[PDB]
Design a protein around this ligand. Structure first.
Ligand code: A1A9N
Length: 167
């Protein structure tokens, strides 16, 4: 039993809700919140900009030190950093950004990072400003993640389409 509330159950392990991931994280304080990151951990917009803003830029400060030490992530890769005031940990996961021409096949690799954590609050990877089809992202999530994932989402109209089209 966990403290996630109001989710629709899609499969044995995948749950979904129309919600602002920032507000959800602040309420639940999950062990792991997933950020929709880029390889430079430059948290400008979408989920990343919103999460970072909610940390008063502490996420960005920590991220800049991470990059200075380690260099950029890989597309499809991840790193674990602090969750600041939002969660114990933040799993920064880089899905392919179609608006940069990146290979959508890497979306499965991106979701595989979730399997290293027993429970996660997460957005749909590569959705929104990353330019992929969210119906496809949800399908890849369900077919790749085996741990317990609570998907937040932002767009109410999109949420209804995802539920109604889910197979
Ligand atoms: C990852 C794409 C997604 N964006 C978000 N989802 C959940 N919480 C959010 N908070 C700020 C942005 C955001 C959407 C489906 C709306 O395009």
């Amino acid at each position: 039993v966990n403290s996630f509330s109001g989710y629709l159950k899609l499969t044995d392990n995948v749950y979904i809700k129309n919600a602002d991931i920032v507000e959800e994280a602040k309420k639940v304080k999950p062990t792991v919140v997933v950020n929709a990151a880029n390889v430079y951990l430059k948290h400008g917009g979408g989920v990343a900009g919103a999460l970072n803003k909610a940390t008063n830029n502490a996420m960005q400060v920590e991220s800049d030190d991470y990059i200075a030490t380690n260099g950029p992530l890989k597309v499809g890769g991840s790193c674990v950093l602090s969750g600041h005031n939002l969660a114990k940990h933040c799993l920064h996961v880089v899905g392919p950004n179609v608006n940069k021409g990146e290979d959508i096949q890497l979306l499965k690799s991106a979701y595989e990072n979730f399997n290293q954590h027993e429970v996660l609050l997460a957005p749909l990877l590569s959705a929104g400003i990353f330019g992929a089809d969210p119906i496809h992202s949800l399908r890849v999530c369900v077919d790749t993640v085996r741990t317990n994932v609570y998907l937040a989402v932002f767009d109410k109209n999109l949420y209804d389409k995802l539920v109604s089209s889910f197979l």
